[PDB]
């Protein structure tokens with residue numbers, strides 16, 4: 174258990190939420206930069222977020238893909254869990270779309286392809302369903318390639334047509350079959366892909382109401398509509414991804430991602446080239462240094478950091494000693 178919190182300099186707040194914070198850090202000994210997610214044990218326990226936290230840890234440790242965030246270290250103190258991950262310097266797609274309103278079909282295509290590559294890997298090679306696709310969880314690396322973050326809602330052990338039970342996800346992104354609450358399969362990820370790609374090309378959610386009651390009714394009952402400037406292949410792709418019956422959805426059959434990969438919207442895409450990062454990103458992040466946070470909301474980066482500075486074997490109900498938090502990537 175070599176690295177500890179004292180091995181890092183804490184530079185800037187990147188993100189914050191009910192469960193904890195994510196800080197831009199420098200490993201002092203190497204000069205390398207990372208995003209460190211710091212969670213308070215007491216909070217995770219109180220909010221029944223333990224299982225999610227442990228799932229993210231396992232999924233990160235078990236996965237290696239161009240478009241998935243890589244984990245460098247995970248470790249714990251008596252009161253905290255720390256995940257030291259590759260820093261996605263280009264920020265959230267949420268940040269960009271908020272400012273730009275829409276992406277071109279070509280730009281949405283590039284992101285869509287990298288997302289499909291990542292999800293295909295998870296489904297096919299890892300038997301993992303992601304369940305939480307949304308613009309906040311889709312980040313850009315310094316070169317402009319996708320990095321998916323936040324694996325806490327994943328389900329492991331989902332092979333082929335195996336089903337899942339848990340009601341989870343983000344309300345505006347929930348698939349009809351999730352809302353029905355009578356079991357669902359891996360095609361929930363393709364609904365999620367539909368929502369994000371719809372947002373990218375159309376500049377709004379496919380279904381929205383500030384009241385969750387009304388929102389859920391729309392998702393279940395309302396036929397999809399598109400702005401009339403949307404091209405025919407994009408309309409076709411989104412229509413297929415946003416079919417309410419997962420059995421009728423693009424990606425919803427035995428071939429899974431391969432059905433999406435073959436859709437005419439992605440005609441000409443060479444999928445091995447996607448994997449190899451041989452497509453030139455349409456937007457290159459213009460960061461001037463390894464610490465430039467221009468693609469992060471000032472609401473976060475303006476905040477002051479004061480990290481709190483024996484107890485190595487302490488294992489309590491409120492602050493447990495958790496398993497698999499002695500990780501350093503080989």
Ligand SMILES: NC1(C(=O)N[C@@H](CCO)c2ccc(Cl)cc2)CCN(c2ncnc3[nH]ccc23)CC1
Pocket residue numbers: 187188189190191192193194195208210211242258259260261262265309310311312322323
């Ligand atoms: N999308 C990020 C984020 O704040 N996510 C939100 C959830 C979605 O709204 C978040 C807030 C707080 C916490 Cl503890 C975890 C996740 C941006 C800041 N984060 C990162 N920033 C830059 N590089 C990163 N690599 C790994 C994570 C990360 C965490 C993910």
